[PDB]
Paper text:
We recently discovered the cattleyene synthase (CyS) from Streptomyces cattleya and studied its cyclization mechanism through isotopic labelings. Some polycyclic diterpenoids have attracted increasing attention, e.g. gibberellins are phytohormones derived from ent‐kaurene, while phorbol esters exhibiting the tigliane skeleton are currently in phase II clinical trials for the treatment of acute myeloid leukemia. Substrate ionization is mediated by a Lewis acidic trinuclear Mg2+ cluster, bound itself to a highly conserved Asp‐rich motif (DDXX(X)D) and an NSE/DTE triad ((N,D)DLX(S,T)XXXE), to which the substrate's pyrophosphate docks, with assistance of a highly conserved Arg residue (pyrophosphate sensor).
For a deeper understanding of the increased but less selective production by the C59A variant (CysC59A), its crystal structure was solved at 2.30 Å. The active site residues of the three structures superimpose well, with the exception of F86 located between C59 and the substrate binding pocket. In the apo‐CyS and CyS‐GGPP‐Mg2+ structures, the thiol of C59 is close to the phenyl ring of F86 (3.4 Å) and renders it towards the active site, while in CySC59A this interaction is disrupted. This slightly widens the active site cavity which may lead to an improved uptake of GGPP, albeit on the expense of selectivity because of a less tight substrate control through cation‐π interactions. The C59A exchange widens the active site cavity, resulting in a relaxed product selectivity, with a series of unprecedented ring closures and skeletal rearrangements towards 6. However, such alignment based targetings cannot fully substitute for the structure based identification of residues, and in fact the position analogous to C59 in CyS has not been targeted in any other TS before. For this purpose, all 20 isotopomers of (13C)GGPP, prepared enzymatically from 13C‐labeled FPP, GPP or IPP precursors, were enzymatically converted with CySC59A, followed by extraction with C6D6 and analysis of the product mixture through 13C NMR.
Numbering used by the authors: 12 to 363
The structure:
Amino acid sequence: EIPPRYCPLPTARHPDETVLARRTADWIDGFDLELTPQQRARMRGNDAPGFYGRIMPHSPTDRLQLAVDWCTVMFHFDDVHCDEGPATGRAARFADLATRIVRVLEAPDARLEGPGDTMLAPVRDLALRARRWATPAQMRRCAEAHRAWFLAVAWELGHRAARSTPALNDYAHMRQHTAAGAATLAWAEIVDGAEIPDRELSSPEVRALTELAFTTAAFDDDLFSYGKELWVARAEGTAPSGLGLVEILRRENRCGRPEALRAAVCLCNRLTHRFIALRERVLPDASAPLRAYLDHLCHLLPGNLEWGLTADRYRNPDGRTPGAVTTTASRDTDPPADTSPPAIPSIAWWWD
């Protein structure tokens, strides 16, 4: 199913996944989400502890709980508040809820609860808990990373409402944001307990590294969730969504499905190799917090792959069919023969 991914990076699991799973489930249960057992099962299928624990396998358990908890509520946000509710006024309802969430991260006692709100109390709890470990610059990074995610989701809902297919150039730099890469990883330096110097985090080389890691992970997410996209489309009697690297290359190259999967993986291999090569040049002068950051990006790439191929989120999607979708993967041990920049301008500067 998925042609050989080049990813010569070790992957490891956090030893306290079970503890994290238990507290996560308990923590999200103490608000007012009114979670059905079906909903609690899908959350288990999301394996938030397995996902973040692979990003940070050596982190202390009580601090990792912060990042894990966030994945918990943002899987629920993703599945209940993204592309759902009435089609009439759908964009307005998203943007309204998105800006509330950002504000609560900036001001936990803003009290922006509307009628029937159940996505702000846990976000507030996360903000309050994040203000006990994090520097001001850190908090600011979480808010603005949430803005980047949500602006990209507004972009995404436009395409879903039109069933359009984004051109490759546009998708190639937007996908890191619809995937919430930066918002997902911004918790890591808070868990680590040391501020990454803004001067480093803003340098062009680190920005390339950052966007390489998040784009790669999101393209992989597109790969290991392709089956689900095919299942959903088969169930709903529609064509697969254009919001996905495979379908975009299909439409762009007027090719068949297998050719598109090979092209998608070829691209992923080139991004991954570029990320590794650029990491080599950056490491020597890297402060310890930046090194740690690159360490988490390095665990993210193979960790995301292993999570996505094994998590029930993408195998038993509705929560009632064990093995409806099965997805295979290989590891290509050879680096890509072509190390030059792809013909995708919106991202070419990563090879600068």
